[PDB]
Structure formats: C-alpha cells, structure tokens
Amino acid sequence: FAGVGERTREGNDLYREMIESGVIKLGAERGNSKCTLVYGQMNEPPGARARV
Amino acid sequence: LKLPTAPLQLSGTSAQIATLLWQVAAKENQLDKVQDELYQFIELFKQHSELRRLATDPFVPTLVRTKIISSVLKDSGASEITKKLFEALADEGALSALLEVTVNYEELMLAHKKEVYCTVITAEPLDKLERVELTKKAEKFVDAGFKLVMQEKIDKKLLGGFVIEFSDRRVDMSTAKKVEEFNNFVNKLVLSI
Amino acid sequence: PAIDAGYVSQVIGPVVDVRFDGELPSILSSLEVEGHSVRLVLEVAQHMGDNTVRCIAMDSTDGLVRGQKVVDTGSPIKVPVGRGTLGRIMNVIGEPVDEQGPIDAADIWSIHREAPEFTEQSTEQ
Amino acid sequence: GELPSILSSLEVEGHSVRLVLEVAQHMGDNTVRCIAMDSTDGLVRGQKVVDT
Amino acid sequence: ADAKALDELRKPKFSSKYLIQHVSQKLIPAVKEWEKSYQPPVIHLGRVLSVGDGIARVYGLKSVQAGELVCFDSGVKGMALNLQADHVGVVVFGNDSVIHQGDLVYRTGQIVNVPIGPGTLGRVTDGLGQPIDGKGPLTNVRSSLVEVKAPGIIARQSVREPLFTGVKAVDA
Amino acid sequence: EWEKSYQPPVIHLGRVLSVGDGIARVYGLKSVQAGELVCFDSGVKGMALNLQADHVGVVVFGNDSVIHQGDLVYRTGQIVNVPIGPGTLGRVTDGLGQPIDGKGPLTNVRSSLVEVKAPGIIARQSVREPLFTGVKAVDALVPIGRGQRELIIGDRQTGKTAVAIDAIIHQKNCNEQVPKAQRVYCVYVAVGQKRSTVAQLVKLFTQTGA
Amino acid sequence: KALDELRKPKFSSKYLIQHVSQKLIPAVK
Numbered sequence: 026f027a028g029v030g031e032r033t034r035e036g037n038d039l040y041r042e043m044i045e046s047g048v049i050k051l052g053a054e055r056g057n058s059k060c061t062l063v064y065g066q067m068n069e070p071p072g073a074r075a076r077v
Numbered sequence: 078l079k080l081p082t083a084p085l086q087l088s089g090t091s092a093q094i095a096t097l098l099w100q101v102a103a104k105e106n107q108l109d110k111v112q113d114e115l116y117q118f119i120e121l122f123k124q125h126s127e128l129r130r131l132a133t134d135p136f137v138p139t140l141v142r143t144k145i146i147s148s149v150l151k152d153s154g155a156s157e158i159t160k161k162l163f164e165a166l167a168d169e170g171a172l173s174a175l176l177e178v179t180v181n182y183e184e185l186m187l188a189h190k191k192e193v194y195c196t197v198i199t200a201e202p203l204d205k206l207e208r209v210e211l212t213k214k215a216e217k218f219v220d221a222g223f224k225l226v227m228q229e230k231i232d233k234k235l236l237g238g239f240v241i242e243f244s245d246r247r248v249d250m251s252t253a254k255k256v257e258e259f260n261n262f263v264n265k266l267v268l269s270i
Numbered sequence: 271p272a273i274d275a276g277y278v279s280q281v282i283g284p285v286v287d288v289r290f291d292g293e294l295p296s297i298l299s300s301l302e303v304e305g306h307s308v309r310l311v312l313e314v315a316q317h318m319g320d321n322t323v324r325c326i327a328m329d330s331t332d333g334l335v336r337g338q339k340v341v342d343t344g345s346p347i348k349v350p351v352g353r354g355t356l357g358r359i360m361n362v363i364g365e366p367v368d369e370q371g372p373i374d375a376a377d378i379w380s381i382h383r384e385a386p387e388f389t390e391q392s393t394e395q
Numbered sequence: 396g397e398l399p400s401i402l403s404s405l406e407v408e409g410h411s412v413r414l415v416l417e418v419a420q421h422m423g424d425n426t427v428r429c430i431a432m433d434s435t436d437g438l439v440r441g442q443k444v445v446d447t
Numbered sequence: 448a449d450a451k452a453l454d455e456l457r458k459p460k461f462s463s464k465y466l467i468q469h470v471s472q473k474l475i476p477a478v479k480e481w482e483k484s485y486q487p488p489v490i491h492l493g494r495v496l497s498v499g500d501g502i503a504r505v506y507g508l509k510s511v512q513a514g515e516l517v518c519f520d521s522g523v524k525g526m527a528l529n530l531q532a533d534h535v536g537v538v539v540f541g542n543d544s545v546i547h548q549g550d551l552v553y554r555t556g557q558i559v560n561v562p563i564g565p566g567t568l569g570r571v572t573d574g575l576g577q578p579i580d581g582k583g584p585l586t587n588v589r590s591s592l593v594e595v596k597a598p599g600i601i602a603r604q605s606v607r608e609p610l611f612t613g614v615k616a617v618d619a
Numbered sequence: 620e621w622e623k624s625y626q627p628p629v630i631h632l633g634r635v636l637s638v639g640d641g642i643a644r645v646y647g648l649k650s651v652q653a654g655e656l657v658c659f660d661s662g663v664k665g666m667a668l669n670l671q672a673d674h675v676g677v678v679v680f681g682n683d684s685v686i687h688q689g690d691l692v693y694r695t696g697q698i699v700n701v702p703i704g705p706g707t708l709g710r711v712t713d714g715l716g717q718p719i720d721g722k723g724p725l726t727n728v729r730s731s732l733v734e735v736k737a738p739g740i741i742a743r744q745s746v747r748e749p750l751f752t753g754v755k756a757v758d759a760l761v762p763i764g765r766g767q768r769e770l771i772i773g774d775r776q777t778g779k780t781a782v783a784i785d786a787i788i789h790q791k792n793c794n795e796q797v798p799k800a801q802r803v804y805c806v807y808v809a810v811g812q813k814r815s816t817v818a819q820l821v822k823l824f825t826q827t828g829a
Numbered sequence: 830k831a832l833d834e835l836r837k838p839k840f841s842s843k844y845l846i847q848h849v850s851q852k853l854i855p856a857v858k
C-alpha cells in the first residue's frame with residue numbers, strides 16, 4: 026500500500042486494522058506479514074509526495 | 078563614419094561591448110595597451126573592497142559611483158578609451174560586467190594574433206619529422222595564416238595516426254578510427270550486395 | 271571534503287539550489303543537507319548551468335541558510351527492499367515510521383529506474 | 396534623495412492641469428512607480444516632481 | 448564567455464602596473480570625499496531594495512533561515528520567504544506603506560512563531576499573536592512555531608470520545 | 620575507391636551548459652543544422668531545435684539524467700533519419716527506427732529523412748481506387764479511397780483503435796487474394812500508449828497473421 | 830575566491846551598448 030497525499034488518519038486506521046486482521050504481525054512474527062506500507066501523506070511537503 | 082571589422086562574431090550585451098572596445102582600440106593602435114589595463118582593473122577589484130562596492134552594491138548613488146571612477150582615472154595610463162569606458166560602465170552600474178567583457182576581449186585578441194591553442198594526441202611520443210609533417214598536416218584545419226601551438230599527449234588506444242583537439246572541433250586522423258570506419262564500410266557494403 | 275560538498279545557493283520553498291565548486295552530481299541523485307534539525311534529503315532535478323544544481327527537498331526547507339553544507343551521496347534515493355520490509359511502514363526516503371526499530375533490508379534499491387522493455391511485457395488476461 | 400512612502404502624493408511641477416501622482420510601489424534603484432490622478436499627456440522625462 | 452576561461456582570469460596576467468598604484472593611492476581620498484553619501488554597508492542585517500504589493504526584496508541578510516521572521520526598522524514584521532542569490536523575498540505581515548527602499552531589515556533569528564500557553568486563553572490576538580483586545584501583552588506564555596509538521600501515523604489513535612456540539616441536528 | 624579518397628571528416632564539439640527536463644542547452648556546435656541529430660558522450664542522442672546565438676537547444680532522445688554540465692556533444696552532421704524499406708515489415712520499432720522486439724537489427728533497410736516535403740500538385744492524381752476497411756459502417760456510409768486522410772475522432776473509450784485494428788487485419792485478408800501490385804502494407808504508429816497496450820497488438824497481429 | 834560576485838553581471842537596461850557607444854566612439858581622437 027502506497028499512500029500518496031492522503032489523510033494520515035486513514036493511514037493510521039489502515040495500519041491498526043491490518044494489525045488486528047493479522048496481515049501485519051508485529052514483533053518476532055514480522056516475517057509472516059503480507060503487506061508493506063509506504064506513506065507520503067498530505068501533511069508532507071511537495072517533494073515527499075512527488076516521490077513516495 | 079567607419080570602424081574596423083571584428084575578427085570573430087560573438088555574443089550580446091557584454092560581448093558587444095568588448096567588440097566595440099576592440100573596434101576603437103584597433104583604430105588607436107593600442108590594442109595590447111587596453112588589454113593589460115583591463116587586467117589591472119581585475120587586479121584592482123581583487124585587493125580593493127571599496128572599488129568592488131562600486132560594482133555590486135545597489136545602494137551606492139549613481140552620481141557617487143561615477144565620481145570615484147573619474148577621480149581615480151586622471152591621465153596616468155588613461156588611454157582615453159579605457160577611461161571613457163569606465164565612466165560609461167559606472168553610468169549604468171555595469172562595472173560588474175568587467176570580468177565578462179575582458180574574457181570576450183581576449184578571445185577577440187588571439188583571433189587577431191592568428192594563433193589557435195591546438196592539442197594533438199598521438200599513439201607514441203613523436204619524432205622531429207613526425208612533429209614537422211604533423212604540423213604541416215594540421216594547417217589544413219585552420220584556413221588562414223593561423224599558427225598552432227600544441228599540447229602533445231599520449232594514448233596507446235590510438236593505433237598510430239593522431240587526434241587533433243581544437244577545443245571546439247576534433248579531427249580524428251588516427252588509424253583506430255580508420256579501421257573502425259573501414260569495418261563499418263565493408264560490413265555495410267556486403268549487406269548491399 | 272571540499273569537492274563533493276556543495277553549498278545551498280538559494281531556497282525557494284521546496285526547491286533548493288545547491289552550488290558545487292566541482293564535480294556536480296547527476297540528475298536524480300540524492301543530496302544530504304548537514305546541520306538541519308531533521309534529515310533533509312535533496313533529490314537533484316536540473317543542472318542550472320553555472321555549477322548549480324536545482325533540487326527538490328523531501329522535507330520542509332524551513333531553517334535552510336544560504337551557506338549550508340550539502341553532501342552528495344553519489345546515488346539516487348535508495349530504499350530498503352526485501353521481505354524484511356513487510357509489516358513495516360516506510361516514508362519516502364525509506365526511514366521506518368512505525369517505531370519498530372530499523373528495517374532488515376535484503377537490498378537497498380534506488381527508487382528511480384526504467385520501465386521494463388517491450389520484450390518483457392506479459393500479455394495474458 | 397530619499398524616496399516617498401507608499402501611498403504618498405506627488406505633485407508635478409509645470410503642467411497644464413495640476414497633476415497629482417500617488418506612489419504605488421518602490422521599484423528599486425531609487426524609483427517609485429506612481430499612478431496619476433489626471434492625464435499624463437505632455438509629461439516629459441525629467442520634469443521636477445515634488446513629494447508632499 | 449566560458450567559466451574555465453573565466454577562472455583563468457583569477458590569476459594575475461598583466462605584468463605592468465602603471466594603474467594599480469596610480470589609483471591605490473587615490474582611492475581613499477575619493478572615498479573620503481563621498482562619505483556622507485554612503486549608506487553603511489550591510490551584510491548580516493538587511494536593506495530593502497524594492498518594496499511593493501506587500502513583498503519586500505531585501506539585500507543582505509546573509510544568514511537568515513528560510514521561513515524566518517524578520518523585522519523591519521518600522522517595527523512591522525516579515526517572513527523570509529525565498530532566499531535568493533542576491534536578495535531575500537520577504538512577505539510583510541502588515542501594511543507595506545511603512546517600508547521604504549533603504550530601510551534596515553533586522554533578523555530576529557527565529558522561524559515564524561507565535562506565543563502559545565495558558566496565558567493566551569481569554570485573549571483576542573491578531574494573526575501573528577500580538578494582542579488587540581487592549582488589555583496588555585501576553586503574560587504566562589511561550590513562543591512556538593506556526594509551521595510545525597502534523598503528527599505521523601504512529602503518533603495517532605482512533606477517535607473515541609464524542610465532543611458534543613450542543614446542536615441537535617449535528618449531535619444527532 | 621573508399622580508401623583512395625578518405626577525408627578525415629571534422630567533428631564539431633559542444634559543451635552542455637545546462638540540462639534538465641530532457642532539454643540540454645549546449646554551447647558551441649557552430650555549424651550544427653536546424654533539426655540535426657547530435658550525439659552526447661553518454662551515448663544518448665539528441666536533436667538541435669533552438670539554434671540561438673549563444674546556445675543550442677537540444678531535445679534529448681532518452682533519459683537526461685545521464686547528461687551533466689560540461690559533457691561533450693558531438694554533431695553527427697545528419698538530419699534525423701530512420702531505416703525505411705521492406706525489412707521493417709513485421710518489426711516493432713521504437714520512435715525512430717530502432718527495433719524493440721528483440722529480433723536483431725533491421726536487415727534489408729535503408730536510411731531516409733523523417734521530415735520530407737509532401738508531394739505537390741503535379742505529383743498527385745485523383746483518388747479513385749477504394750481501400751476496404753472491412754467495417755461495414757465505414758465502407759457503406761464513409762467510404763475511403765487509397766490516398767485519402769480519414770480522421771478517426773471520438774471520445775475516450777469508443778471504437779477508435781478498433782476501426783484502425785480492423786482496417787489492418789482486413790488488409791491481410793485482401794493481400795492474399797489480389798495480385799502483387801495492389802497489396803496494402805500497413806503501418807501502425809502507437810504514440811504515448813502503454814507498452815502493455817502495444818504488446819497486445821503485436822500479439823493480435825501475429826495471431827491473425829497481419 | 831572573492832570575485833564570484835563580479836562573475837554574474839546584471840544590467841538595468843537592454844540598451845547598455847548605446848551609451849558606451851556614445852562614450853567610446855568620441856573617445857577615439
């Protein structure tokens with residue numbers, strides 16, 4: 026999931042609901058995760074949103 | 078009126094001041110007299126901060142900036158054309174255009190001096206007949222009475238011949254170029270038949 | 271120390287001009303700004319012409335002074351890839367923003383590359 | 396000398412009608428840019444202008 | 448008009464100095480004759496080149512930060528918007544009629560900030576934190592930046608608490 | 620005869636002043652032609668478009684990130700040309716001649732300029748013989764003759780390339796039944812599309828045989 | 830180096846040559 030210029034609230038919601046779905050597993054079970062998140066949300070400057 | 082021709086045509090607004098400074102110093106025959114006192118002012122801007130404050134500071138008055146200039150150029154190496162220049166370059170705050178107008182003055186000068194700063198790259202260091210007949214070979218790439226000085230270098234990936242570097246133009250009379258162009262020719266021509 | 275360290279010539283919002291005394295960096299190379307409050311990374315966009323590169327800043331440029339040392343990294347923005355990036359959050363330049371420690375990178379890949387060729391196109395629906 | 400402030404009124408010395416200029420901005424190099432309250436026809440470059 | 452053909456003009460190449468020591472002994476009396484016509488030179492302060500439309504272009508200010516609150520000698524405050532190679536573009540927090548070409552611009556050393564704290568509670572401030580209600584300056588307060596970055600993903604949580612607005616249509 | 624008269628051709632150089640956004644401004648190249656192909660020392664090609672008195676505006680045929688300030692630009696002396704001939708049939712070439720289908724170099728082919736003056740009034744004759752699209756909405760109501768420009772204009776996802784695809788597929792259906800003279804050899808120029816889109820079209824043109 | 834401020838000249842007039850041409854061609858005798 027690449028978040029390019031969106032709400033940081035939505036990124037936090039997606040992270041916390043991918044944890045409790047088991048798609049993101051925290052800690053020593055990190056290798057059994059199925060999703061990586063990259064986030065350049067709308068509070069970032071225009072150089073960070075143009076490259077994320 | 079009339080004016081002598083410039084040796085080479087060149088750029089605008091700082092290289093046309095230098096063309097005109099060359100075009101009035103060619104009439105007064107002090108062509109190399111204006112050139113060294115152009116180099117003196119560049120040295121004058123180096124060691125005087127109050128002289129380059131008359132070129133970079135926007136807050137100096139345009140009357141103060143032109144009165145210091147005339148009150149230091151009083152009949153000592155004045156030449157009347159680098160003295161009437163510097164009023165005209167302090168009348169408009171263009172004293173900062175001096176590092177740009179002397180560079181264009183120099184390239185107008187060696188075109189008058191008929192010298193071209195060449196460079197030759199040869200495969201092995203030269204003999205004194207290789208040098209002489211290479212020199213006679215190289216005057217076909219300067220179409221005047223132009224003298225060449227050389228800066229002879231060594232490249233063993235040339236297989237003989239030479240590569241002339243005119244710093245705006247390159248002539249590759251080397252034989253590595255000749256065998257690769259020969260191979261391109263014969264590998265193209267057998268596809269044609 | 272001197273060459274391959276340019277200095278901030280001018281700052282115009284997110285656009286920073288850096289002046290290199292010699293050995294200008296390539297376009298798309300990343301430059302690090304030393305002496306900033308946070309990690310400021312500049313990606314080179316243009317070569318302006320008088321030994322000046324023109325850069326885009328990955329962070330905010332507030333606090334940039336027109337003499338600041340800018341260090342070339344000789345490579346684009348390169349981010350940790352691999353299976354070790356799974357279950358992590360990364361920002362644009364690849365720093366982990368999940369407070370889960372560093373990222374176990376299998377490789378560190380440049381974010382700039384070319385599209386796969388016409389020979390490598392899969393056409394199956 | 397010293398420049399007039401922005402929105403200051405300037406009077407033009409010698410003109411068929413009293414010409415009042417109002418200073419709009421400072422252009423730099425000791426120049427103000429003004430807007431005229433009457434016609435500027437017959438105005439010469441170098442006419443004396445009195446700041447009020 | 449090359450650059451390597453201009454750096455070669457840094458080294459001396461004249462070998463004839465009949466004008467260097469002609470003017471080097473005549474420059475200082477000339478500068479002393481026109482001395483009260485000089486504004487004092489400015490490097491770490493600033494001087495207004497041109498002001499207009501609410502944007503002042505400021506010469507000098509060699510060490511201002513981008514986005515830094517500068518101060519004009521009129522008292523009106525600015526913000527160093529774009530730092531350029533020769534000037535600084537300043538947006539003027541106030542009326543630009545009190546700014547003239549030649550005015551000294553003083554750098555305050557801090558990115559644009561406003562007073563925050565418990566003592567700003569109750570008060571009517573202007574857009575820059577200066578109080579306009581007439582009941583004094585802001586006491587029990589501290590200055591903080593106006594352009595701080597928002598908190599990230601890991602510094603947040605979901606909203607849980609209900610913040611009643613008192614409007615029936617809205618809160619229902 | 621070649622090594623008999625072999626003139627060591629002169630190469631003119633130019634330094635890159637500024638480069639960015641796929642434009643390189645180049646100092647020098649005093650004899651470069653307008654529209655002439657130039658060559659950067661990073662191997663990428665160029666075309667001289669803005670001949671100004673101080674620089675040359677060169678558009679870059681590729682990625683400009685491999686060009687720096689002060690790189691060498693060699694003029695090639697030639698206007699932009701492409702390999703034309705019968706060796707281009709079946710080959711998927713890029714924006715100027717060079718093949719991208721991974722099937723080797725273009726054999727049986729010849730260079731020719733891309734900006735040619737169009738044939739004049741004496742060079743024409745009247746459009747009389749039909750080109751069959753195979754689309755019967757077209758061939759009935761909007762008939763098309765050989766030598767006519769017919770615009771396929773429309774909104775976003777309509778049948779625009781589908782009419783164009785069917786006209787190419789139908790020529791393969793007609794070239795097998797007519798003599799050698801009246802056969803139509805198609806060219807599909809795919810500007811600004813995806814590589815995925817054109818890989819579905821070479822897959823389609825190989826499957827039908829077109 | 831201290832002459833990089835004289836590296837870039839900047840002019841207040843496009844017709845700068847018309848003043849130096851009025852001050853140099855009457856400066857030849």
Ligand SMILES: Nc1ncnc2c1ncn2[C@@H]1O[C@H](COP(=O)(O)OP(=O)(O)OP(=O)(O)O)[C@@H](O)[C@H]1O
Nearest residue numbers: 773774775776777778779780781782783784812816
């Ligand atoms: N004659 C037809 N009958 C049925 N379906 C069609 C016909 N022509 C086109 N389509 C369908 O319509 C869609 C659009 O066709 P086409 O590829 O021609 O679009 P286009 O105009 O090129 O659009 P774009 O320019 O966006 O690619 C295609 O998916 C195709 O399957």
Ligand SMILES: [Mg+2]
Nearest residue numbers: 779780781812
């Ligand atoms: Mg289409």
